[model samples]
Target chain A: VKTQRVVITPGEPAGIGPDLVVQLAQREWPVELVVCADATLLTNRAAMLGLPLTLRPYSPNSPAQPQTAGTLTLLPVALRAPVTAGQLAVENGHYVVETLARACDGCLNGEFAALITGPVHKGVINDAGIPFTGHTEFFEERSQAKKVVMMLATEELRVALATTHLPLRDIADAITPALLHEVIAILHHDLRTKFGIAEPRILVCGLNPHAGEGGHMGTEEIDTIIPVLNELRAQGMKLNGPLPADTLFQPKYLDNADAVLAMYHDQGLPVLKYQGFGRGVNITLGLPFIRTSVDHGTALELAGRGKADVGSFITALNLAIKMIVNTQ
Target chain B: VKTQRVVITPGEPAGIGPDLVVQLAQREWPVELVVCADATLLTNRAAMLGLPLTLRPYSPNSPAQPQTAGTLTLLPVALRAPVTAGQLAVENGHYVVETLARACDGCLNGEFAALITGPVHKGVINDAGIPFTGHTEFFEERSQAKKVVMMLATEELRVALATTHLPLRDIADAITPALLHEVIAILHHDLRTKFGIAEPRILVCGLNPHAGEGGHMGTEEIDTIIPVLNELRAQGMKLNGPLPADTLFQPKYLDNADAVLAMYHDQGLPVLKYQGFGRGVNITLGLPFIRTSVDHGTALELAGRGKADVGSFITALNLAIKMIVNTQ
Candidate 1:
C-alpha cells in the first residue's frame, strides 16, 4: 500500500504562507504533499526569504507523484499580475479561493488523507467582492458539513468554539438550542473519531461571567447553555460546566477536560494564544476530511524576512498526519 | 509619620479564609495589619494548619498596634458556635457580615489605608437571609458610592467589569447610559487616583462578540457602548473599544492600557485568572476606602490542609500598600 499524502494550501499571494510552505517542504515527513497555490507567489516569496525549494507546477486535475523533500508539488493557480511580497492585492483574491477549492476537492476525493492550510487575508479577500467570512465557513459550505466546530489545539489544551466570530451582544442569541445541540454533538463526535479519544470529556464555558452568577450577571447560562448541557449530560457524554471561562483552565478542570467549548472567540483564544504562543493549530471538527491550519494569520511584514516562524504550521502538519493515521 | 495600615477581613468562620489569613500573616511587610474576624476562628485555623501564630484579640472600636510577625491582630467578632474548618454554618453568617462591616468602617474612618478581604460564601451569607450579593455591592452600599467598578489585576493584565454578575440576556439592558457612564467615569478616575496612571488609557470590550461585527451580530456597541466611549474620549479621557475581547490583549493594546473594561464578568475574569492564576487580586475601584481581595473562593479541600496558596492574598496586600503609598 502507498503512503498517504496530505494536500496543503499556502494562502494569499503576498503573504508569508508561501515562505512557510517552502520551509515546511524542506523538512522530512512520513508522507507526500501536494501544495495548491500560485507558482509565481511561491517563487517570489522563496526568493525574498532566501529559501532554496524549487517549485514544480502540476495541473490540479492531473495525478502527480509523491512530493519529495526540498521540492514543492504545486497545483498551480497563477496570480492576475506580478506578485510582490508582503503586499495584499485584491486582484489575487480569486486565486486564493481557487487554491482552497482545489485543495478541498483533493482531500474530499481521497487524493489526500488530510489538508494543511496557511493564512489568508479575509479583509482583502472580501474587498475584492468575494463573499468570504473565513476558511472554516468556506470549507463548511464547500463540504456541505451542516455544522462544524472550530477547535483550537495547543499541547496542553483544545478549545472548541460553540459560537465563532460574533458580536458579544449576539452571542446569547447564537447559543440557541439548535446551535448548541449541533456544535456540542459535532465536538463530541470529532473528539472521539478524528482526535482519537475513546471517551471525550468537554468543559463548556458559561456565556456569562460566573456562569451568569445564577442570573445576576447573565442569563444565557441559566436560560440556554445549562439546559443544553443538562440534555447533553443525560445523553451520557462526560460534560462539565457551563464553568466560568476564567478559572476553568487551572489544575483540576483543565486536567480532566479533553476539550473546552468556549461561549465566544476572545473568551478562550487569548489564553489559548498566550498558552500556545507560537505553536497553536486550529482544527475543524465534524468534517469528512481531517483538516488543520496554523492559528496565526499572515504576517505580511515577515513574508520574506526569513523571520516567519513555522512552528504552528509544522505542528498543524504533524497533527493532521497523526489524526489521519490514528483514524485508520 | 506612621506608614498606613490595611484592614483585613477573614470572612466566614467555616471557610478557608482563616487558614489563608494565617498563611498571609507569616510574611513580613511594612504596613500595619488588622484582621477583623472571630478570634476563636483564627486561632483554631492556625492550629489546624499547624502554624504557630498568636491571635491577639481586641474590641472592634479599639485601635491596636500592628502585631509582630507570625501573629494576627484580631479585632474579634465572636462566632456563636465553635467553628470547624471546611464546614458552613448559617449561624455564623451574621458574624462574618459584622466583621466585614467593622473592617470597612475602620477603613472609612481613616484608621486603615486599605481593606484586604478573604473569601466569603455568597450562598451561606444569603441563606442567612441577609440579602448580600458580594463584597463589591456590600461596600458600594456602605460607602454610598453611586458606582463602583470591579477590577481584577495580576502581573500582566488589569480588567474592570462594566456589568458584573448579571445574566447574559439582561446585560444589554443593564448597560444603560447611566450605568456605562458611571462605570467608565469611575474606572477613569480611579485609574488615575488609585492605580496612579495619569491620562490612563482604558480599553472597553464590546458587549457582543467581534464588538458586534460592525453591528451585524449585535447593536449594543452601536446603540450604547460606542457612544458612551466616544463621549469619554471627548472628555479628554483615553478610552478605546468596544474592540473584540479576544484580540485586544496583545502587547500593543495591553501595554498602553491602564485597564481593560469588559462588558460582562466571565468575558473578562477568565482571561484575568489565566494571566494571574495563583496571583490574581480583585480590587474594587471608585470606593472611598481602598479595598482589595483574593480572586479565589474558599476551597474546602484546601481547608486545614495548609496547602492553599497565598500568592493572591499576598499580592493583594502588597498592591494595597503600594496604592496607598502612591496616593501619598
Candidate 2:
C-alpha cells in the first residue's frame, strides 16, 4: 500500500521557521510531515518551547505514515553553527538554502506529495554570498519550470498575481499578452485540476484604474489586457474583466469569482492580507509540484519568546495538505 | 437664527443621481438640503418610484432651516432635455455640468456649509463639449484650490490617494518630492482641522511594491516617499510609513491610524470599496468648502426603478454634515 508524505522546509535556523514547525507538531496530522533540517535542531527548539517532539528518522525505503502529535520525520541536514534565538549568522545561511533545495528535490521526485515552507531571512542568505532572489524564483529555476504564478489565499479569497516582485515603473511594460495568457492558463488549469472546478471563473484587474477608464486614463487596458482576455475567452475560459480593481473586489463580484488575477503584487496582496488577518497562505502556482508558504517573514526576535503567531504557518500547511489530497 | 445648509448636485440628468436625491428625501435631516437641479425632475423621479415628494422653494432672504422628511429645497437649475431612466442625451450633458457648477458656486460663497454631490457622467458631459475631468478637479479649479486630495471613507476606513486616474507607468514618475510634500501637508491639515485629529498619523504606502524592497525592486521609496515622510514627521506631524502596501492595511496598523494615504488610485481603493460595501463616501480635501460625494457612479439603468442603492449618497451627506460640525 502506498502512503503520502509532505516535505517541509523551516528555513532560517535562528528565525521562527523552526518555531512554527515545533508549534505545528503539537497536533496530529493525517499525512506524514518530512521536515528537512538538522534533527538535533528540532529537538533543541522543542525543548526550549517546552513542547514534546519526536524526530523520526526518514528512509526512502520506510513506509510513510501520518505524523503523530509531538513528532516529525526529520530528513537530516547538517548545520554549520549552533543557532540562537534572535541572532543572525552568515555560516547558517548555506544551511537554510540547502534545506529548501533538498525538500524541492524530494517533492520533484514524488517522494513528497507537497512542499510547505516557513519564512527565510533574505538579507542573511545574501550575506552568505549565495545568489538567492526569493523562494518562488528559486523553486521556479531549480525545477526548471517555465513560468509560475504567485497566489496568496485565505479561506475567503484567492488572489493570483500576473507579475510579481517587479518595480511599479516597469510593471506596465511587463503586462504583455504572453505573460497574461500564460498566467491565466496556469490559474485556470490549477483551479480546475487541483481545486476541482470544472469551469474556473477568474476576475482580472485592469492595469490602470477604471480599467483605464475606457482609455481616458491609460491605454494598457484597451491595448494589452482586453486583447489577451478576449483571447482567453475565445479559448472557452470563464474570465471576467479588465474591470476596475477598486470596484471588482466586492462580494457582488468576488463571491462568484473562482480567483482574482491582479496585474501586480500591490494591487492584489494588500486586500488579501487584510482580509486573511494572519490566515493567509502564499501559493506558487504553475510549479512542477505544489508549494505553499506562510504569507509572512521570519521574526528572529520572536523565535524563542513564544510570542509569534502561527496562524499563517498553519494555514499554509493545511492548504498544502489539501492540495495534496486534491492531487489524488 | 442662522442655520447651516448643504448644497447637492444630482448630476447627469438621465442617471441615478436624481433617484438618489429622491430616495434621500424620505428621511429628515438636521440641516437644510439645497439641491441644485430641475425641481420638476426630482418630482417626476419620485412619482416614477411611487414616492411622495414636496419641492420647497428656495429664497436667499429666508432663514435656512433643516429639511423635513419627503421634501427638498429646490435651488433649481434648468435641464435642456427630458430625462428617461438609463438614457443618455448630449443636450443634457451641459445641464449636468451647469448643475455642479451652480452647487459649487453656492458652497464656495458660504451660502451652503458643505457640498454633497451625487454621481456625474464624465462621458456625456464631454459629449456636450464642456471641458470636465472629474468632480474633484472641477471643484479644485472652480474654487481655485491649489491642491486637493481625493479621500474615500466608510465608517471603518479612510483611504486617500496621492495620484489618481493616471496610467500605471506614469504613477512612478509622478511620485516626486514636490508632490509628496504638498499631499502630506494637505492631508495633515485637513485631517487635523476637519476630521478632528490632533495628530494625524497617516500610513502612507510606497510607490513600488515592498517599498522597492530596499531598492532592489524600485528606488522611489528611498529617493522620494521616505524623505517626505521624515520631513513631515520632523514638523511634529505623526506619519507612520512608506511601508509595503500589502502589510500596511492590516488591523494591527489600521486600528490606530487616522487615515491611509495610498500612492495611487487602485493601490488604495480596491480594498476600501471592498470593505465599504456600498456605504463609501468620496471626499475632496484642501477645498475651501467641505465637499463629499457618493463613492459610486451613475447607475443609469437603476434610475426610476427605485433599485439604486442610496447608501453611498446618504453616507456622503452624513459625512458632509459631520465635517460641517467639525469646522464649527
Best by TM-score: 2
lDDT values, one for every candidate? 0.82, 0.88
Interface RMSD, prediction 2: 0.8
lDDT score for residue B121 of model 2 = 89
Best prediction by DockQ: 2
DockQ of each: 0.53, 0.83
- Tens-digit per-residue lDDT, B84-184, candidate 1: 78888887888888988999988888777899999998888888889999999999999998888899998657899988777665677788888989998
Q: Report how closely model 1 matches the true complex, as a DockQ value.
A: 0.53
**Collision count for each candidate, in order:** 20, 0
- Candidate 2 per-residue lDDT over residues B7-99, each given as its tens digit: 999888788999989989999999999999998889888999898899988778989888999999989888898878789999998888888
Model 2 C-alpha RMSD to native:
1.9
Encode model 1's per-residue lDDT on A163-254: one tens digit a residue. 77665556667788889899999999998898788889899888776777777676677778888889999989899978878778776888
> Over all chains combined, what TM-score does candidate 2 have?
0.96
Which residue runs of candidate 1 sit more than 4 Å off their true CA positions?
A14-19, A38-41, A44-50, A56-69, A77-97, A120-134, A214-224, A296-312, B57-64, B212-227, B240-242
